[PDB]
Design a protein around this ligand. Sequence first.
Ligand SMILES: [Zn+2]
Length: 178
Amino acid sequence: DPSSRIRAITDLIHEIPTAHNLCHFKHVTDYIDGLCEACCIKGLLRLPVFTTVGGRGIGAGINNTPPFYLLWHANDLAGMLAQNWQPWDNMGIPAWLGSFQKESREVGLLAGMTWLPRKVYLHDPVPGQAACCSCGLPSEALVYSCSIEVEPVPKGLEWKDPHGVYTDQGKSLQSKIK
RNA sequence: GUGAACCGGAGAAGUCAUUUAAUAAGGCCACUGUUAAAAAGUAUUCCCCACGCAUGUGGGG
Ligand SMILES: [Zn+2]
C-alpha cells in the first residue's frame, strides 16, 4: 500500500550510499540519481534474504542477521536448478500473489522465500536520458523515489532457511570479517 | 580519465631500587762466531770546448 513516508530509491541498494553516513566510492546524491527498469527489480528481489538490522526499526527479517548462503554450483542455468531441487512436503502458501496473507506460526517455502520485511511502493518513471547508478546503461526512464516503512516479523516464528547456516541454536552464522 | 579518479591511523608514557670473584704456585739444568784483506810507487779518469797538433796546455760538469 502507498504509505505516506517517502524515501530515496537508493535505500534498497546497499552498495550505493543513502542519507546520513558518507558518499565516498560512489559519487551520487539523493533524488537526482535514479534506477532503470531492471535494477529496481534487482533491489526488489534482494528484500527477503539480505535485509540488514538497521537503526530504529531493528526487526530485519526472517533470518535477522544475514548468514552465509551455501548452494551447489553447475555450468548451466537449467543444470544449476537440478542440484538444488529439493521439494518439501508442503509448498507453504504464495506470498507474492497480491495477498499479504497473515499465516500461522508455521510457515512454508513459497511464503518463506518471498518474504516482504518492508512495505514498498515504487513511483512512476520520469522521462529523461541519463543512466542509472547501479548498472550504468543509458536509458529513457528512471525511478527516483519510493515509499518504505519498516514492519516487524511476528516473534517466535518457525522457519528453517533451506540455504542458511546456524551455529548451535538457530542463531545465524554471519561473516566475522572486518 | 585503468572496480578507476578524489584519499594522514592519528594524539601519550623515567624500567627505577640491592651486590669483592675471592684464598696458591721458581720456567728450571747445556752452548767459540770461527778462518780474510795496502785507500795508495802509477802506465786510460765517466763526459763537453778554444788553439797550432813532437807520450799539448787552458775552461766547465
Ligand atoms: Zn541499471
